[PDB]
Amino acid sequence: MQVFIMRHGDAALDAASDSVRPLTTNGCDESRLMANWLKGQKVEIERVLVSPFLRAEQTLEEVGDCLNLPSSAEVLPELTPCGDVGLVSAYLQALTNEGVASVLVISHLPLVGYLVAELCPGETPPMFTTSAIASVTLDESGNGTFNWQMSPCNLK
Ligand SMILES: [Ca+2]
């Protein structure tokens, strides 16, 4: 199963509180940039998992505007910055055994980095710039391979 791990886009520093910080114009722009790149890669997203935080959901909105995404999305509490990478890993393994062919995961630091390591043996937490995407091929036994990583700058 193809897993695409994405860090939410650039977000405003100030808001009533952290969970509600909106995306910035640039954050939107770059998120659409990465979305179109994926579209050009013949990427077909079957399932979507997103953090409950506004910046994650908005990144999803923006992406969904350029890439054909599922009508629904699953808002996961464990995708927040302090999310339990173990439960995220298990959720992904579940979908893998379910038959799901591909999933797009939109989250935050430091979770995104740890998630890749947790899923892929021998890998250290990679560095994620905003809107950057990590590709991981996960098998039924929870064994994942870190394929590549793409960021708005390596396209820009
Ligand atoms: Ca469009």
Report the 10 Å Cβ neighbour count for 151.
19
Report the 10 Å Cβ neighbour count for 139.
12
The string over 29-46, giving b where at least 16 C-beta atoms fall within 10 Å of a residue's C-beta and e elsewhere, is: ebbbbbbebbeeeebebe
Cα 66 to middle of ligand 1, angstroms: 4
Stated in angstroms to one decimal place, the resolution of this structure is 1.9
CATH, residue 28? 3.40.50.1240
Phi first, then psi, for residue 133 (nearest 5°) are: -125, 135
Cα 67 to middle of ligand 1, angstroms: 7
Residues 6+ apart with CB under 8 A from 19: 52, 53, 54, 80
- Side chain identity, residue 90: A
Number of domains in the chain: 1
Q: Which structure tokens are listed for 83?
A: 């999310």
What distance in Å separates the CA atoms of residue 4 and residue 20, rounded to the nearest whole number?
24
- Side chain identity, residue 115: L
**How many C-alpha atoms does 99 have within 13 Å on its Cβ side?**
0
Q: Which domain holds residue 86?
A: 1-156
Cα 95 to middle of ligand 1, angstroms: 28
Q: Which helix (H) or strand (E) holds 58?
A: helix 54-66
Tell me the technique behind this structure: X-ray
> What is the end-to-end Cα distance of the chain in Å, rounded?
28
